[PDB]
Symmetry: D3
Subunit: 173 residues, 6 copies
């Protein structure tokens, strides 16, 4: 069950996202993690977040979905509380080092990472989603991203900077 | 959670299979279910199985993976006993009519269906799998298909006919 | 010429549709037949059509385009009366069992099947068609679907139910 | 029916080949015609064929499959003598200018063109064909290409040069 | 460095265009050159250009991007004056025969070819471009195509015919 | 010319690699950079390289090909000494921050990064390359990777560990 080899970790590029949504091509978790890392780096710096917080979010962004090399990438609505608790233990066996980073992550770094994880999905579907259901998922994810940020421990000024950067970015995507 | 609309059921063609395996293109559950239905029809008749048993397996084959319109298509190794029990209840809420057909299916029809469900995957990867991991998965699925058939309630003569047809088919695929 | 083997019938997933229309990906006849079957099942029941009529349309839907494993999937405008008469005889040699089902099909089951065969194409292009010509073909097929239904032997109440379901479905596709 | 506009002729790149054969991607008739033209140019010159003969074959190669913008690209085995006679008249209405070039083509230019038309298909499948059926079609086309060349009006020395170039080319493709 | 073999020239279909722009699929230089040739042929004749000028533009269109079999297809904005001078010498070593045709091309044939080379790209992106950046590139290329034509040695009447045909074509693409 | 915006950096996933080589799909520079980063992290640690050296190679791996968002991804054989000198200055204007990291990189970190940059390409083509030319490029890149490592400043023990890990990885890819 545990992922221990580089040949297995390289299969991040063989893991297809958007399993229940029509898209122009099958996006993999490697390109997703690189783009989430990029957003953490750029938007964490734009929001004036502490260097240690941005570094922690970037480090997590690069490996955060590695358990999907075994589990597959399940659609967010499927992950109900009872399923997520079972998945938490399974993912801890698959990628113990990722579980350790997750357990150490400061709340501010977690909120920067989660904002970027969701923003990357909205930005991806803006270009590559096909059809009414994909349109609805893109808009639902944007609504969820905003609500989570608004209710987060991030300072209002930081939330505003993140939304300022997100809106500017999606307009040119 | 429950699937109630034709526009949702049509999304069987938007559900991508092989979420953790490299393939030439993203196969969807609609083409998979049609091919499993075809194998149940042809191989059930070739094995001289009772018409009622073949009909039951074909009817189940056409809708068996419909819950994946909500859950996504998780890789078989991920479905451990504890996860499968949680998934059974969730899938019963998603597609109650499919759960009812599954609960009514006779053991012989279930074994014909399962043999065809797995054979379709091996046949698909024979043409469309890419790389060492896909090669291993194709061979593991074939080994699992054979072991399940060998330990099933199907008569030895029926198991032999099914293996006779499977081997002839894969050689020309 | 005759299709006699399961390895040949499995090639329904190797037969590409939309040979002269730009699309996001090459849809195959297996996913098409599964979706047409689904529409016959759901919309035949929604329209309150007799169970025997719905069953006949569903049975035909699952195999109706199998001759295309040999002929290829020719674009509808190409099939003029003189060509269709030649193709009828060729297809009868390729898939005699499909020709027998076609010859037995009741007019009401044929009209439910044809409405669903065309509706599936319009629904597919709504999501996956690319460009002006694909847009025109999607709209021409919808116009043809409506005209055929309006001039059919189906009761006005059944035609209205089918159009009610079609419009609701395409709006969410 | 007649193709009269540049926007229609540009749809050569929207016409998918290999309608009944599994391939890595959908090759269009525009890339096919360019490659057939290239083979006529290079191999006609390598075989020392008269400049007028090579020019005629190249000119035909560039437009030879244009009627498929309306008809679709039917698989060669489907084109039986009776169907080909009906298709000849239909294609003459679709592309009268292509029909005129075909009617004027000298036997030697026709044989250079046909050798290149078939060789391009074998070369394409060598790289992009997937599965047993595609393998068989690639080998059947090569056998047909050789038999037609061997029975043609081309001088033995020209046939040998064409086969010499074909074998060298496929080895490095 | 020099391209000398037919197996290398056949790789025109392995050279992907739009290296920095999101598209529905990877268009190759073979389909591009065929479409540019088609536009030169049709639009050169529609504009009443001399037969020798149209022939020269068509001949160049068919081979003009062959050096990209070695260089790759670099995005137009990247080709600054200093880089283009270095590339001119490299391309002359790669495809000496293409360099000779380019050096012989009359200004009017060059302007017909360049108008068609750019128009083909705008027409391609109209159907197959994805996202804001692809939209901007499509519109920038159209602006560049118009400005170059307006400042060219072509007679105003010829420029008007070319724009008349371009606008009619894109409206139906 | 300079890349200054996150919406531009996100286009790493719109930059297609392998511009002159046939592949199963168009790999982008984002998935490439993530995989190169992964190889630097895992193989740098496996080789017992100093933590500061591994960190420097990983940091460079994540952004090393960002200038290709403007330049496109040119094939390695095209980058001759004279072209590389011109490209060095252009890339310094496009991504000044990447140029600064490159200028600061220690020789050992550069050799770990370059080994991983090339190994990722060989591993990618092992699964996704199509045809004779792609096969030759995969083998040429492996030969180049080995020769550069053998002539590098890395200790023989480190070179042996890197080759030990590379061979184990490719066997299971
Ligand atoms: N509402 C949704 N419906 C369907 N798919 C969705 C939805 N939200 C996220 N996703 C996808 C994106 C990733 O593949 C995965 C989350 O990591 O789930
Ligand atoms: N051993 C395996 N590794 C990875 N993927 C596998 C394996 N076996 C089956 N699959 C896929 C096929 C379907 O998408 C899905 C089962 O419905 O899981
Ligand atoms: N007007 C049309 N133009 C082009 N293609 C069309 C048109 N109508 C249907 N099709 C396609 C759909 C199937 O592939 C096939 C019919 O089974 O033809
Ligand atoms: N034996 C064959 N089986 C299936 N497809 C074949 C066969 N030979 C040629 N083709 C394809 C290639 C073109 O798409 C088209 C001929 O222009 O038919
Ligand atoms: N402004 C642009 N930005 C990005 N890509 C562009 C642009 N203009 C042309 N192209 C592409 C088209 C061909 O692949 C190639 C020119 O032969 O460059
Ligand atoms: N010998 C070669 N022939 C063709 N393409 C090659 C070769 N070596 C590398 N590549 C590709 C890989 C990247 O896209 C790019 C280098 O970053 O060039
Ligand atoms: Co996920
Ligand atoms: Co994620
Ligand atoms: Co601010
Ligand atoms: Co499944
Ligand atoms: Co299944
Ligand atoms: Co028997
Ligand atoms: Co059809
Ligand atoms: Co049909
Ligand atoms: Co009603
Ligand atoms: Co054809
Ligand atoms: Co042809
Ligand atoms: Co000779
Ligand atoms: Co170019
Ligand atoms: Co060009
Ligand atoms: Co005029
Ligand atoms: Co590069
Ligand atoms: Co690189
Ligand atoms: Co060691």
């Amino acid at each position: 069950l545990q992922i221990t080899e580089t040949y297995e970790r390289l299969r991040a590029s063989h893991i297809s996202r958007w399993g229940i949504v029509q898209t122009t091509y099958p996006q993999n978790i490697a390109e997703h993690m690189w783009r989430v890392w990029l957003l953490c780096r750029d938007w964490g710096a734009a929001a004036g977040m502490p260097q240690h917080t941005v570094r922690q979010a970037c480090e997590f962004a690069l490996v955060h979905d590695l358990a999907e090399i075994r589990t597959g990438d399940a659609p967010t609505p499927h992950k109900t509380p009872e399923l997520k608790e079972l998945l938490a233990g399974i993912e801890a066996q698959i990628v113990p080092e990722v579980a350790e980073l997750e357990a150490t992550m400061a709340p501010e770094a977690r909120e920067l990472w989660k904002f970027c994880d969701t923003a990357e999905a909205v930005l991806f579907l803006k270009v590559n989603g096909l059809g009414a259901h994909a349109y609805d998922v893109q808009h639902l994810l944007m609504e969820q991203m905003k609500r989570r940020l608004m209710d987060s421990v991030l300072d209002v000024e930081v939330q505003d900077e993140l939304m300022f950067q997100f809106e500017r970015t999606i307009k040119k995507t």
